[PDB]
Design a protein around this ligand. Sequence first.
Ligand SMILES: Nc1ncnc2c1ncn2[C@@H]1O[C@H](COP(=O)(O)OP(=O)(O)CP(=O)(O)O)[C@@H](O)[C@H]1O
Ligand SMILES: [Mg+2]
Ligand SMILES: [Mg+2]
Length: 404
Amino acid sequence: MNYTETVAYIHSFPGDHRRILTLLHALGNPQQQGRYIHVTGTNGKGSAANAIAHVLEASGLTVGLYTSPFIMRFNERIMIDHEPIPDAALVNAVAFVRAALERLQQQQADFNVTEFEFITALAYWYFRQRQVDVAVIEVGIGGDTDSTNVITPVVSVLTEVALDHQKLLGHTITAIAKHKAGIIKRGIPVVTGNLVPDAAAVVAAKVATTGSQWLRFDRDFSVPKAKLHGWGQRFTYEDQDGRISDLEVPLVGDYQQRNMAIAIQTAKVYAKQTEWPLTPQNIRQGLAASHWPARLEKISDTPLIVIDGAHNPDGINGLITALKQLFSQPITVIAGAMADRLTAAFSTVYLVPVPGTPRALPEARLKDSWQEALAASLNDVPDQPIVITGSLYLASAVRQTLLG
Ligand SMILES: Nc1ncnc2c1ncn2[C@@H]1O[C@H](COP(=O)(O)OP(=O)(O)CP(=O)(O)O)[C@@H](O)[C@H]1O
Ligand SMILES: [Mg+2]
Ligand SMILES: [Mg+2]
């Protein structure tokens, strides 16, 4: 197949890990080789994972990064030193995994794997083929039964536990926490955010049984100082070894302080566990040189356009709150019911549908598309800033169009 057929192939796919393990076994069990950092959490995993990678890359390691979802194009989900797998490399890898799959389907007639299982198996194989020093692995959903959970990492990360995936993980924080805690492994250290009580209890009980060292935000490490500074933040990190002062990261949003602190502590743990050098300078450089697409990103200066994947209140309110701090003057917001918090916060607020979703009737200011809303604002008030937010899918659609 060619590249386009290959991607189509991947997306044509339909409780334990037997299916993926069978595929991995046919691929030579690449998941058993090399090193990994396993990251989960209801919110913040992509952010923490991305930062951990930048930091370790700056220290001189070749780093695999597996994240979801993609923003510009599929290839972004499998990176090595932040370079997406090349189109031709994807074709070859898909061909290789497909051949193993088909061979397997000869032995066991109705053998199949899910889409995430196929991609995950391919990513593990690819990371090993390229012999990366370490692969930073973002859990798809939950932890314990997530398709990525067939590895023993050097360190595990649990950013936070919230109700976002109730329909699959459970009805209570405790239930969801048990899923996330499933990536904590025997003797392997775990770095977490300052988890709410119910989640913290689940983790405390888990590390008691695994004997894992548990480093927790606001207990073992923290961010004593932090302020907005340009389209980013200047902050101080502190842990058992002291402070790394005035670090800078091109990321706005209060919650990103916790995610960056988690990233820093995790990189330090990884480096210590592997007897690898990691300096405050490596950390500073990784954080500075890092970048975050579609998450409160100012994709343009004149006109001033910002795209955001703010999905939940924490993000949108962190947005509204950041917007307020970032902008003291009138702006336009194109959002595709955190809506009420926007219309009361900003002058011009347009509501549009999310590009790849069914338009639904309003339950007892509205435009038919982001392009129409963008065009209108630019025509009416060319110099008024425009912030696009609401969904990652909309953000991604806009970025693809405007930065393509
Ligand atoms: N492009 C984007 N993608 C995801 N979350 C984004 C975002 N832009 C802003 N955010 C906000 O940042 C936080 C999520 O960041 P991150 O991408 O690191 O999370 P995550 O990867 O754990 C979620 P998922 O399970 O959907 O992949 C949330 O508060 C979310 O609303
Ligand atoms: Mg999720
Ligand atoms: Mg993610």
